[PDB]
Amino acid sequence: KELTRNDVFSSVFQNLVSSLIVDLPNANEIVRATAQEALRTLSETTQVPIATMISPCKHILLAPIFGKPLRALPFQMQIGNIDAITFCMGLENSFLEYNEELNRLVQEALALKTSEQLVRLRVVCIQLLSLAITKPEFAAAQQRSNIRVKILVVFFKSLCGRSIEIIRAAHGGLKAVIDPKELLQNGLRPMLMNLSDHKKLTVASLEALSGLLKLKVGIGSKLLDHLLAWAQPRTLQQLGSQDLENNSTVQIIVAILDVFHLLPPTAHKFMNDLMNALLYLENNLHRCQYSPFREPLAKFLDRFPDESFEYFFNEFSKREI
Numbered sequence: 001k002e003l004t005r006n007d008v009f010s011s012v013f014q015n016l017v018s019s020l021i022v023d024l025p026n027a028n029e030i031v032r033a034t035a036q037e038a039l040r041t042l043s044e045t046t047q048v049p050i051a052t053m054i055s056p057c058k059h060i061l062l063a064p065i066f067g068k069p070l071r072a073l074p075f076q077m078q079i080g081n082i083d084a085i086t087f088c089m090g091l092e093n094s095f096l097e098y099n100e101e102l103n104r105l106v107q108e109a110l111a112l113k114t115s116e117q118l119v120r121l122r123v124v125c126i127q128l129l130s131l132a133i134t135k136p137e138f139a140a141a142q143q144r145s146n147i148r149v150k151i152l153v154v155f156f157k158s159l160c161g162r163s164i165e166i167i168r169a170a171h172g173g174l175k176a177v178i179d180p181k182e183l184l185q186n187g188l189r190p191m192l193m194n195l196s197d198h199k200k201l202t203v204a205s206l207e208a209l210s211g212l213l214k215l216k217v218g219i220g221s222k223l224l225d226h227l228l229a230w231a232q233p234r235t236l237q238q239l240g241s242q243d244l245e246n247n248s249t250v251q252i253i254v255a256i257l258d259v260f261h262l263l264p265p266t267a268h269k270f271m272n273d274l275m276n277a278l279l280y281l282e283n284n285l286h287r288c289q290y291s292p293f294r295e296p297l298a299k300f301l302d303r304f305p306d307e308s309f310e311y312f313f314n315e316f317s318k319r320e321i
Helices: 012-023 029-045 050-054 059-066 075-089 100-111 114-134 136-142 147-159 164-178 181-196 203-213 218-231 248-258 271-284 294-303 305-313
Strands: none
Touching (some): 012 059, 029 075, 100 147, 114 164, 147 164, 164 203, 181 218, 203 248, 218 248, 271 305
């Protein structure tokens, strides 16, 4: 608590800071998190910035952080190194331009239970790229290298992927970088082609569609057509006794209803038809009190409350609605 000055911060305190820094890129996640938290609390208890404390002895981390390419290093050490990149860059100022080599390295690594480790590496890569392009200090440096368009197209390609977690990571990165129309249309063209397919849309596809629409009203009608195609023939009659919590078709159609939460802000064309379809699903499913389909409609009604309110008010006479 009583440490006062940088010269006092030197010698043994500098040794402690060096120990924390060398322990930062360690493979073990718990060790890395503990080191980060300890560094933050040690900096705050001495009333000096973290970057000021770590700048004098940054070379001990510098020696293995960039000299050894990630490809040669083992996978866990790669995760530790990239997390160290993210944490060190997350401070005020350091590594003005020399991390762009690792930027190309991570781009080429991303372009192509070990599967869980690969997923973790990919999501950390998404986070690293989003943070790197977010801060204007490195954007000003990278403007002439035209890397930002590469970052955007790689983010779009990842958002075209199948794993839901990397979809969420890419959506978060895109949200961060919002605060390119031709590139956006080019990237959404495969999404439009995928949405054109009927009865061939997975839950990850619907989640990606929702993420893209979070950024064209006929898409809603097409989703209604897919809903109807999934809905009539045999599903409701079979699911009368079968549980609805863990049937794949049920999750798919729940996603179909859910992606109607973030439709364009204008008044929805077939809201009447949407709720008639909901009544269809509820009645021929032979369920009266509760149905899982209600909560996808809850937020949809909340976002557009007025017209729904009157449309149910004029239907007050009948009990079912």
